[PDB]
Amino acid sequence: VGEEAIVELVENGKKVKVNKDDIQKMNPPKFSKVEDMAELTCLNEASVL
């Protein structure tokens, strides 16, 4: 719907409305606990955290 998207939260199943610019992309589990975060495919606050 342009500005907003609906997501389901993995810990709840709850459906929530989130703004398209607050969603951040997620790295494949392939990059779990990478030693150097420069190697992350998606580099954003959520991925570094």
Binding site: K20, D21, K25, L43, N44
Partner: protein, 31 residues
């Protein structure tokens, strides 16, 4: 002044819209 007041409201609304769109452009660039 009403003539100034309405234009100032439109200006602040356009500023808010620009500040919103800047988030989208920033995210698109970083992606």
């Amino acid at each position: 002044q009403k003539d100034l007041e309405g234009l100032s409201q439109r200006h602040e609304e356009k500023v808010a819209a620009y500040d919103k769109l800047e988030k989208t452009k920033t995210r698109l660039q970083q992606e």
